[PDB]
Design a protein around this ligand. Structure first.
Ligand code: NA
Lengths: 30, 21
């Protein structure tokens, strides 16, 4: 489900599910 | 950056996983 164009809330939701308990950083600005 | 690699182009598990802590 990750090999697609993931934008906005869709991308943060993928990070939330793949990363789990680990957490992640979302830096759009870059 | 992530938007460029996963929004503007197709993402991968490798890329997402680089943003996990
Ligand atoms: Na890409």
């Amino acid at each position: 489900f990750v090999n697609q164009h993931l934008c906005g809330s869709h991308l943060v939701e993928a990070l939330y599910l793949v990363c789990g308990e680990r957490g992640f950083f979302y830096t759009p600005k870059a | 950056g992530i938007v460029e690699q996963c929004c503007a182009s197709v993402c991968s598990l490798y890329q997402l996983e680089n943003y996990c802590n």
